[model samples]
Target: HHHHFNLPPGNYKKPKLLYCSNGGHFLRILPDGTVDGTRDRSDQHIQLQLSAESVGEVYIKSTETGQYLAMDTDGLLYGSQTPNSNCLFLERLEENHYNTYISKAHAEKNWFVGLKKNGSCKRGPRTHYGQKAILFLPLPV
Candidate 1:
């Protein structure tokens, strides 16, 4: 997880890892989201290193309440209370790809709606046009 928040006894110890057993696993989310915690044990709590600025950021605002939120690269989540069968919200993943892109064809697909602050995007939980999040990445130095 991105340890950006300044809090607590500076207990900045690396996350602990656990071994997997035969046919045993748990469901969880990771910081970088490279590994699926729900399917593997290697992601008990993956540690991500802090990087320099220049990582581009983005923000999204709610078309309803007019509030705003942010997102991180590759981070995923779904719109709150949005129809699970036909959702339409996601961040751009790569060229011609989106991290949260949703369509009727991919309605069954599971996604992620970042709960806290967007690490890279630097936005919030509510934004315009139901655009509650942003697509973000570090700027290349």
Candidate 2:
């Protein structure tokens, strides 16, 4: 079970893990900007560091690859080392008390990280009504 207010207080850094509820997979990123899921706990490439950037916004980075999560022009998730607007995300709390991340560019208002059954991620609409859209689960980093 998870807590409603499980996040830490103040400015901090921790592993930001994304869980695909449909398949019980952890989100992973490939060097080619592909997203996938894995069951291995030691896959540090999937482990991410989440930190507050400004206000409610946060910056996500890979702990192993040292790349930032970014979005492409077609609303796909990728990783990059250079800074860009697509690297920013807003922590939005849903009615279920879980948080959904909204992108900072392109489909900013309505697009969030939606999960596929095979451990991949998609650009889903802004609706936390289902498990796919609310798949981000941050455990102890």
Best by TM-score: 2
Error of 2 at 92 (Å): 1.6
- Which sections of candidate 1 miss by over 4 Å? 1-6, 13-39, 50-141
lDDT of 1 by residue, 1-141 (tens): 221222212111332221112122221234332222232324323222211121221222222322222223333332222223223333234322212222222223323332223122212223222332322221111
- lDDT score at residue 21, model 2, on the 0-100 scale: 63
Error of 1 at 83 (Å): 34
Q: Against the unseen true structure, what C-alpha lDDT does each candidate score?
A: 0.25, 0.65
Identify the runs in model 2 with alpha carbons over 4 angstroms from their true place: 1-11, 107-109, 124-131
lDDT of 1 at 64: 31
Candidate 2 residue-wise lDDT, 51-120, digit = tens: 7777666777877877888777677788878657888876655545456666767433456766666666
